[PDB]
Design an enzyme around this catalytic site. Structure first.
Site, PDB file in Angstrom:
ATOM      1  N   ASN A 184      28.964  14.008  24.340  1.00 40.48           N
ATOM      2  CA  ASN A 184      27.961  14.274  25.380  1.00 40.48           C
ATOM      3  C   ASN A 184      27.382  15.715  25.406  1.00 40.48           C
ATOM      4  O   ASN A 184      28.102  16.697  25.195  1.00 40.48           O
ATOM      5  CB  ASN A 184      28.578  13.909  26.751  1.00 40.48           C
ATOM      6  CG  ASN A 184      27.592  14.013  27.895  1.00 40.48           C
ATOM      7  OD1 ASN A 184      27.531  15.044  28.605  1.00 40.48           O
ATOM      8  ND2 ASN A 184      26.802  12.958  28.076  1.00 40.48           N
TER       9      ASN A 184
ATOM     10  N   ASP B 263      41.307  19.554  25.242  1.00 39.35           N
ATOM     11  CA  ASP B 263      40.751  20.205  26.433  1.00 39.35           C
ATOM     12  C   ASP B 263      41.609  20.063  27.690  1.00 39.35           C
ATOM     13  O   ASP B 263      41.476  20.876  28.609  1.00 39.35           O
ATOM     14  CB  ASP B 263      39.343  19.661  26.719  1.00 39.35           C
ATOM     15  CG  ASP B 263      38.550  20.549  27.664  1.00 39.35           C
ATOM     16  OD1 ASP B 263      38.492  21.775  27.424  1.00 39.35           O
ATOM     17  OD2 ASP B 263      37.988  20.021  28.648  1.00 39.35           O
TER      18      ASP B 263
ATOM     19  N   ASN C 145      22.425   9.031  29.896  1.00 33.59           N
ATOM     20  CA  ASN C 145      23.203   8.911  31.123  1.00 33.59           C
ATOM     21  C   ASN C 145      22.384   9.215  32.356  1.00 33.59           C
ATOM     22  O   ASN C 145      21.343   9.877  32.291  1.00 33.59           O
ATOM     23  CB  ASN C 145      24.416   9.835  31.058  1.00 33.59           C
ATOM     24  CG  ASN C 145      25.393   9.412  29.992  1.00 33.59           C
ATOM     25  OD1 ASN C 145      25.410   9.958  28.888  1.00 33.59           O
ATOM     26  ND2 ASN C 145      26.189   8.396  30.300  1.00 33.59           N
TER      27      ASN C 145
ATOM     28  N   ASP D   8      24.643  10.841  25.123  1.00 31.87           N
ATOM     29  CA  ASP D   8      25.813  10.654  24.224  1.00 31.87           C
ATOM     30  C   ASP D   8      25.333  10.385  22.804  1.00 31.87           C
ATOM     31  O   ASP D   8      24.420   9.566  22.603  1.00 31.87           O
ATOM     32  CB  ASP D   8      26.677   9.479  24.673  1.00 31.87           C
ATOM     33  CG  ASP D   8      27.200   9.609  26.097  1.00 31.87           C
ATOM     34  OD1 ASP D   8      27.501  10.737  26.580  1.00 31.87           O
ATOM     35  OD2 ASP D   8      27.294   8.548  26.744  1.00 31.87           O
TER      36      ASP D   8
END
Ligand SMILES: [Cl-]
Ligand SMILES: [Cl-]
Ligand SMILES: [Cl-]
Ligand SMILES: [Cl-]
Ligand SMILES: [Cl-]
Ligand SMILES: [N]
Ligand SMILES: [N]
Ligand code: NA
Ligand SMILES: [Pt+2]
Ligand SMILES: [Pt+2]
Ligand SMILES: [Pt+2]
Length: 129
Positions: A59, A101, A46, A52
């Site tokens: 990630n 999350d 990235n 990733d």
């Protein structure tokens, strides 16, 4: 390893992903299709310098350690290389922590853009599950 569609579905079910946090098995298979094309060895670098890893393209900024993402955390407590294994256990256990999350499966960009709202049950059609 490059999984077949029904083969991956069966593995995800045995490892308890089907209907986890209310997300049906088709959602998880669709996400894997568009994140990695079912290839456990997939990687993607990235712009921010993070990477990733694996079938669900998890990630390194928050979730795993690769030793080359400054300021990052390792909330799944694993080396990122564990996410590349033919055995999907580490990827499944970390995905469970990510989808709990707060934003659900919106954490996977390919899921939001290519699976969310679609006929995801098509991804498990024909499979002996
Ligand atoms: Cl489904
Ligand atoms: Cl890349
Ligand atoms: Cl690091
Ligand atoms: Cl598991
Ligand atoms: Cl949710
Ligand atoms: N499992
Ligand atoms: N599991
Ligand atoms: Na990290
Ligand atoms: Pt397995
Ligand atoms: Pt498991
Ligand atoms: Pt297993």
């Amino acid at each position: 390893k490059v999984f077949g569609r029904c083969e991956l579905a069966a593995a995800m079910k045995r490892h308890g992903l089907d209907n986890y946090r209310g997300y049906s098995l088709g959602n998880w298979v669709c996400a894997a299709k568009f994140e990695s094309n079912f290839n456990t060895q997939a990687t993607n670098r990235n712009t921010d310098g993070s990477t990733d890893y694996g079938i669900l393209q998890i990630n390194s900024r928050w979730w795993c350690n690769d030793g080359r993402t400054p300021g990052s955390r390792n909330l799944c407590n694993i080396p990122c290389s564990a996410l590349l294994s033919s055995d999907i256990t580490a990827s499944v256990n970390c995905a469970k922590k990510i989808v709990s999350d707060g934003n659900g499966m919106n954490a996977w960009v390919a899921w939001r853009n290519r699976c969310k709202g679609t006929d995801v049950q098509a991804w498990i059609r024909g499979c002996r599950l």
